Amino acid sequence: DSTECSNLLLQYGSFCTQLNRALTGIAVEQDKNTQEVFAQVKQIYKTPP
Amino acid sequence: TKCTLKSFTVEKGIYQTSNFRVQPTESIVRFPNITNLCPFGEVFNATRF
Numbered sequence: 852d853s854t855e856c857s858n859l860l861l862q863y864g865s866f867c868t869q870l871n872r873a874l875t876g877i878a879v880e881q882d883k884n885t886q887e888v889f890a891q892v893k894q895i896y897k898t899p900p
Numbered sequence: 901t902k903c904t905l906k907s908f909t910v911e912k913g914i915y916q917t918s919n920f921r922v923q924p925t926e927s928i929v930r931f932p933n934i935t936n937l938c939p940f941g942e943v944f945n946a947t948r949f
């Protein structure tokens with residue numbers, strides 16, 4: 852949270868905003884692994900008592 | 901989201917567009933405790949100079 856420091860980032864371009872997409876890029880697919888390894892069935896079965 | 905996506909037709913999905921933080925207002929500072937006074941009265945108001 853430094854105003855003058857942030858100005859130095861603008862002239863350096865679009866690096867960190869790009870990897871923020873990349874980090875979210877891995878994050879969104881990180882959960883995508885879960886349903887394709889656990890949510891293989893759309894019917895929830897309860898065992899008999 | 902439109903500005904960061906560089907488009908006017910955004911699809912249904914999650915989009916992280918910015919960040920937020922709480923800005924301090926008063927910025928209080930209470931470090932000191934007045935002690936170890938060196939007498940300036942012994943050099944300003946001494947009887948004999």
Ligand SMILES: *[C@@H]1O[C@H](CO)[C@@H](O)[C@H](O)[C@H]1NC(C)=O
Pocket residue numbers: 940941942944945
């Ligand atoms: C000395 O006495 C005068 C008059 O009371 C006062 O104005 C001055 O601040 C005193 N000096 C010190 C540092 O004691």
